[PDB]
Paper text:
[name] [name] adopts a stacked three domain architecture, with Domain I (DI) membrane distal and Domain III (DIII) membrane proximal. The apical surface is comprised of several loops from DI framing an apical groove, and a single extended loop from [name] ([name] loop) that packs against the side of DI and is stabilized by three tryptophan anchors buried into pockets on the [name] apical surface.
Previous structural characterization of [name] in complex with a RON2 peptide (TgRON2D3) revealed that in order for RON2 to access the [name] apical groove, the groove-occluding [name] loop must be displaced. To probe the role of the [name] loop, we engineered a construct of [name] with the twenty residue mobile portion of the [name] loop replaced with a shortened Gly-Ser linker ([name]ΔDIIloop). This engineered construct of [name] was produced in insect cells, purified, crystallized, and the apo crystal structure solved to 1.93 Å resolution. Importantly, a comparison of the apical loops that frame the length of the ligand binding groove showed a maximum deviation of 0.91 Å with an average rmsd of 0.35 Å over 13 to 21 Cαs for the six DI loops indicating that minimal displacement of these loops in [name]ΔDIIloop is necessary for ligand coordination. Overall, truncation of the [name] loop in [name]ΔDIIloop appears to faithfully mimic the displaced [name] loop form of [name] and thereby present a mature ligand binding groove. Intriguingly, [name]ΔDIIloop displayed notably different binding profiles compared to [name], aside from a similar affinity for the cognate ligand, TgRON2D3. Collectively, these results suggest that while the [name] groove is fundamentally capable of interacting with all the RON2D3 peptides tested, the presence of the [name] loop imparts remarkable selectivity. However, since the presence of the [name] [name] loop results in a more selective receptor, this substructure may act as a structural gatekeeper to restrict formation of unproductive [name] complexes.
Author numbering: 69 to 340, 361 to 428, 431 to 435, 441 to 469
Amino acid sequence: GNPFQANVEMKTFMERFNLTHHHQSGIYVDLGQDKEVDGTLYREPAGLCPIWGKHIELQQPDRPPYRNNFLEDVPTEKEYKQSGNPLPGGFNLNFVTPSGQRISPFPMELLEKNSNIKASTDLGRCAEFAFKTVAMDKNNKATKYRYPFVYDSKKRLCHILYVSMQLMEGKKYCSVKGEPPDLTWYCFKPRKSVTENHHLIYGSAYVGENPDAFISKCPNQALRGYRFGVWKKGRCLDYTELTDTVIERVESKAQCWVKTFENDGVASDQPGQPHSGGVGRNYGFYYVDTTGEGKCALSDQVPDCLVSDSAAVSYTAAGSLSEETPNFIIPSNPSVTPPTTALQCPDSFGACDVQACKRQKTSCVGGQIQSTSV
Ligand SMILES: *[C@@H]1O[C@H](CO)[C@@H](O)[C@H](O)[C@H]1NC(C)=O
Ligand SMILES: [Cl-]
Ligand SMILES: [Cl-]
Ligand SMILES: [Co+2]
Ligand SMILES: [Co+2]
Ligand SMILES: [Co+2]
């Protein structure tokens, strides 16, 4: 009776929101796997979806030589000796080829021209590049450890991050703006900003295993005009009707989008199972309460239906603030189904929910599926 599971076109579309199914790992901190280097088992990011706007914010001293930018090269021994504690620089792999050719960041133009790179989108080409890049051990032998990446979609640069850590905190473990001075590491944590670094896309290398998969399987963009919901008692209940939903006031829809990533319940693999598998309070929407206040509803329930609401926007921890598809995830061949028709289009009513005294109404309006309770 659920229209969003009724026809396959609808089902397929709704699948992209199931981060347990496709992404399958932590989002805030992604450490879903473990791989051996130099006889040592290291935690490895593993998630299959790109995480839009995610960046790692550093807490280095606010002064030279420190840049507080995780895309800077990992420091050389000499740079570290020059700075003293904490480590300066960032997370970027600083290695060069036997030629002396820099490995990261790597320009998308060269990946586009590399016949061995099969992905059909620039974001996919970066992920594939990361998937085909493995850590070399102390004996310069290949391992199965793959570094995570950041795609800089503005500069069209693919960063391979030698530092795969995503969160460190506590004065026992790391320093904030140089205090305690005895510690090697500065503190850092993942972040999404209402205004900054929307052009940065974080991912595990395993986004690149089947590079074109994220296009259909991942909730890359915000969804305008609908509230996420769950099919219960023959109708679609948006999150505000569920008991375990967190509802909070926000000043803007972008604050809500940030909350779906930064709230304490988001899928995360950090100590800090320790393997979330993608389970978590990853889902939310902005809406306007009857009193006119902007609010944000957050849930760990994977949506399986939608409720129409022209003033709402549904977000996930994985996706972007924008509802608009950017050109760097539109495939350059016609075989791969593009990311964007699923919700276009008889007035259908459903059995009365006596418990709430409302009924489903599934219709078509403005060439677009309506779904509400009456
Ligand atoms: C989401 O995916 C998981 C894993 O495949 C599955 O167990 C669950 O039933 C799915 N839920 C929805 C709402 O599709
Ligand atoms: Cl001290
Ligand atoms: Cl001391
Ligand atoms: Co699936
Ligand atoms: Co593990
Ligand atoms: Co923006």
